[PDB]
């Protein structure tokens, strides 16, 4: 149960939604919807397709970095032993990410407006 990130649009990919494609080099691509899957089939570069988050972040249209809360997210390959106190205060850290990221999201676009 992982909400993966699509290869094309860089958006969320929930269970059931989309397609999984395995290439001969054992590389796994996940496509959220038929639009991104067919665009991948035609081999259109995400950095040259306007409506993709990959293009937006690589074209200066999205934040350079957000070191929000001294840590924002990572693909942790070392599992951590289950604790309630850790699990509850990290539940709170989730939200505290969200308002802070929401605040900086407002500030960045206000800066880009002028």
């Amino acid at each position: 149960m992982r909400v993966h990130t699509c290869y094309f649009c860089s958006g969320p990919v929930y269970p059931g939604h989309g397609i999984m494609f395995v290439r001969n080099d054992s590389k796994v691509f996940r496509f959220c919807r038929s639009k991104c899957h067919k665009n991948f089939k035609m081999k259109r570069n995400p950095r040259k397709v306007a409506w993709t988050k990959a293009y937006r972040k690589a074209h200066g249209k999205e934040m350079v970095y957000d070191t929000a809360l001294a840590v924002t997210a990572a693909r942790r390959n070392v599992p951590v032993r289950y604790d309630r106190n850790v699990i509850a205060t990290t539940l709170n850290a989730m939200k505290r990410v969200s308002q802070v990221h929401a605040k900086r999201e407002r500030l960045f676009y206000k800066k880009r407006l002028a």
Binding site: M1, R2, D25, S26, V28, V78, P79
Partner: protein
């Protein structure tokens, strides 16, 4: 040396992986396999009833030693969390972003030295040395790339194909610093790793293993005492 069958299959190395600090058994089938493992290692090392990526070939999908454990990319977060909770704290777990997902087929690793698939990624080799804390060497076994499946490793002994030559036998023993014997498991099947799982003090093989083969594994692994 003991004889066991997972379900009604002679390949127990495929469906289980055994180290000197823990045991892993497949989930969802018959626990008679888990029952047999607990009968000999329940009071020594923890036994984890685990799956890897919703799959029962955990033995050939995960490679590990008494120190650390590795899981492939397809390992789910829930299963990885399950494995961490089950295993004790002094054991570390690591995900591997390896193209060759079958870690149990590309890596044959004991507590001190590991011999790996020749075409393994450099980053995989570095993290293997970091987690397993073993010296890693790229070489083939009897001209065959699947070292983990075609060779079984322990601290005091190891087995390879009967197809290997004597000079290859000597070179492999010299590069591994452990006695090595050319043999077969499960009555002529040359998949030693798939048919045999061995820790430093006990050995498990399929029920179809011949008496002569069991004597060979006992002789090389010095398990009479």
């Amino acid at each position: 040396a003991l004889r066991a069958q997972f379900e009604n299959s002679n390949e127990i190395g495929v469906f289980s992986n055994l180290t000197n600090s823990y045991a892993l058994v497949a989930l969802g089938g018959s626990e008679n396999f888990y029952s047999v493992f607990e009968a000999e290692l329940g009071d020594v090392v923890p036994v984890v009833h685990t799956t890897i990526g919703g799959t029962r070939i955990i033995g050939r999908l995960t490679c590990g030693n008494r120190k650390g454990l590795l899981v492939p990319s397809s390992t789910t977060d829930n299963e990885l969390q399950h494995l961490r909770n089950s295993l004790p704290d002094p054991v570390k777990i690591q995900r591997v972003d390896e193209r060759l997902s079958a870690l149990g087929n590309i890596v044959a690793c004991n507590d001190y030295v590991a011999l790996v698939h020749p075409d393994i990624e450099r980053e995989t080799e570095e993290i293997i040395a970091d987690v397993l804390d073993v010296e890693v060497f790229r070489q083939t076994v009897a001209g065959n790339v699947l070292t983990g499946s075609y060779c079984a490793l322990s601290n005091q002994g190891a087995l390879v194909h009967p197809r290997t030559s004597i000079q290859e036998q000597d070179e492999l023993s010299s590069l591994l610093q452990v006695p090595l014997v050319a043999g077969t498991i499960n009555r002529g099947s040359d998949v030693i790793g798939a048919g045999l799982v061995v820790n430093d003090w006990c050995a498990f093989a399929g029920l179809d293993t011949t008496a002569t083969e069991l004597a060979v594994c006992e002789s090389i692994f010095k398990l009479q005492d």
